[PDB]
């Protein structure tokens, strides 16, 4: 038993590390500062730029019916709701928006979230607990893997969009736990991958889940509103009934031009999330003027289905004009609105490759007035997919500035790569 | 230190031993009054109703009814979660000496007649054995082991 | 206060017995999921089905008006044997005692909203991009300069959610090999942020600085649990004011100990940034703590400024590091532009830079109203928690069946309150929070006090002698 | 609401009867009445 | 017989109610 004098010396000898490491000169860069909008033609520094870095795939930023819908909500409710959904934070527009969403998709019930990132790190820990088994894709983004880590269950990974690997992994799990037959099992995937721009092959995941009795959790942020014939996501793109997917989540910062997220499914599942979640019970509810714009956007999408035809033509045209690139290679699916350019024959270093892309984005913005986005990964990120440059093409881009983003990007690759 | 588990932290506030005893006196008065009988046949019913409820609540169910703590106690009964697992504390001693005291009352009032003595001794032995300090986290022949 | 405990335990035991009895038949009449496992096991939500569903009309009440001093409450009328309460028409005008607009910024006012609308007319409600890509506008650049020169730190960052500001920032600061010591009553966002990192978590007794030192010495003298390695870091987390309790932290005593043992201080002040303080600068201005003695300072824009979001304030190096490695800054969508104009204008009104005197009257009314209400409750016999200067003040009920009785008797006479029970509190300690606003008038508070006196006579919650 | 009707209300919320179903409280109020007559009748003869 | 078991149990009671609390070791 230590005497009280020894503990004093022990506490005086201990020396801690700094709160943050020293800031090196290569990690203090700044992004552009916009004015006037974030549409296809925004304004930076007094010059006119062409924007390929915002994810409004339908071209709804700055629509007349959204301004008109948000003004009336701001003149009647104010800006905030002042509390969570369980203490007088339920305004009646929240109840109208959940109904409008589930009538569009064709489900019984919906639930709304105030932050688009929180809809996945609060949903996965709500269903999966310590003894369960989750099978994930390895390519999922940081919001999914944070929710995977917070739920203390066992996580197994399969290769990116590879169905042979998924079948092998499912058979392997259905031999290790053959004893306890009352096992909770989930498959976690993502409709269009943010880190690769590839589309999940859903008609086969559904065949495999019905064979080993698994449940699917799907993240439809980059597919909701763009990918079906009528806009209802990936399920009607592959012609599978929405009832076979158990949980469907989405974020409203893409293609609806809003903020927030939702989840959709049974009346039994949605009613359990309302009482034991984390970003729903211990957070304030969505400002009403943001929920009043989602209702109008869902109406505009539902009445105008030629926007979804125009988006596909824009994507195909950018593919036609960008196929002679020299040091890069297109590694995205031909339907997705996230065009992903890869770097062939990397320089070798994990941090010398990023410098080249960050340099070739800056030159594009400086010389040709283009906003493109390059990969920025946190040290907490566990994704090991290749890095590259992404373009978010929208229905609002014209054919004039669509071959301006290929002619300006084929010129910096034949001059800065080899 | 503070307990940080809603499944057990409530057992340290005042009035809990007193309510434990009052429930057992109220049960005896109810058994006597609803069906006229003798004190011994009422203390036997109390003694055997205190076994079914207590064994199922303390030594059979595993986990917690609160899901915030994802599954951190899935493999533990309520008795094993008590006091963070520390043995022979104050509340554990009280919960151990209650069935022993309740056995003597049910035996001395029934004149040690056999039809009931077998049951009243079996209950006490099973209840006291499950509370031994060396019987922690051990399942017999795998029952309730997963 | 002894027979109250005995009655509380008795009533909870009765609820437990009846719930188990009904569950033993439910799980037996199911013999009169095609290989799929159940969503939730039968006893993993026992108190949601057997306790919370009994008192369901006391929660999630819809309102059809703005959250002001008075509002309109929609009524619900479930038909299917009380399973799904669905709403009707025909609202009723109530007095608001349950929202969080401490300074009265939660409706239309004549300075803020006109400037909010013309910012929306120009930036259109969202950018659909992250801050490092295309989500930085002029408004976002000006908001951080306003937050910096109002909190009192070299630099600041703004996020779009206040739960995420904890649960995504704590993992960036500490990892496996570090220690976190936390107050027993910290918010869920802090606990989830601490679990999101690999660090070890220890806890100390609520608001007792003599136990914090006892924990620090024992943890430093030992090292990491099995291999007595030195700890890399220690971070101590406290809150400016605790809403369920209504009390203010013992911050000078915490900061004196943390300097002695070389720990870092993380301060969460979401219920105190606008409410308390002579000029509304929070707990550091009230308790005279030097703002250079805390390393990270966090806040929310929901309780006083009538908006959404959160912030971190610290030094230049901390902010430069976060803007390079933080998942919320790199991956999320930026805070909406009309919702940042709100915070800019609210700070201008409080600081007095709108060219008016409303910002000082708000601060003088919130101090005056809550003192009067708290001093009036205590002489009637209620047990009221809180220190003296808080705007939140719970009332002890103790008995689980006194929650619906109190709530339903107040609502029938047009007063709206919040009540909380077991799962969210300790077993013995159900209560009702009261939130006072700077927009409440004197002849509203007299009406509320007159109603609450009558209701407390009937329920019998006057546990102390009157005057 | 007079004195007796008031004290009954207080009893209901003090012992949890207020937030139960009609038959659940019916099964308890009658079981308490059965217990009361037993005590009031084995104190007038047993101790006499 | 009817009063020896009572003493037997009273002995184990006073043996139990004197022990000092402890916690199990680590690995
Ligand atoms: C009607 C008057 C009383 C009726 C008798 C029924 C009361 C039985 C008490 C049950 C104690 C439960 C202890 C642990 C149970 C765990 O298994 C479960 C599942 O993990 N924990 C939970 O659900 C969360 C814990 C919350 C339980 C507290 C609510 C009940 C509080 C009762 C007051 C405490 C004093 C009694 C202590 C134990 C008394 C044992 C009952 C005696 C048998 C009566 C037969 C004559
Ligand atoms: C320290 C701290 N951090 C975060 C929050 C919630 O942040 P938000 O209002 O930005 O969601 C609260 C209040 N939390 C509210 C929910 O809105 C409540 O449940 O009472 C808090 O006290």
Residue numbers in the entry:
A (entry chain A): 63 to 480
B (entry chain D): 11 to 156
C (entry chain B): 5 to 36, 41 to 475
D (entry chain C): 1 to 48
E (entry chain E): 36 to 62
From the paper:
ORM/ORMDL proteins are negative regulators of SPT that respond to cellular sphingolipid levels. We determined the cryo–electron microscopy structure of Arabidopsis SPT-ORM1 complex, composed of LCB1, LCB2a, SPTssa, and ORM1, in an inhibited state. The SPT-ORM1 complex is a ceramide sensor in the ER that controls cellular sphingolipid homeostasis.
The ORM1-dependent SPT repression is largely relieved by LCB2a-ΔN5 (deletion of residues 2 to 5) or ORM1-ΔN8 (deletion of residues 2 to 8). These results suggest that the hybrid β sheet between ORM1 and LCB2a strengthens but is not absolutely required for the ORM1-dependent SPT inhibition. The flexible ORM1 N terminus is consistent with the greatly diminished ORM1-dependent SPT suppression for the LCB2a-ΔN5 variant. Together, these results suggest that both ceramide binding and the formation of a hybrid β sheet are critical for stabilizing the inhibitory conformation of the ORM1 N terminus.
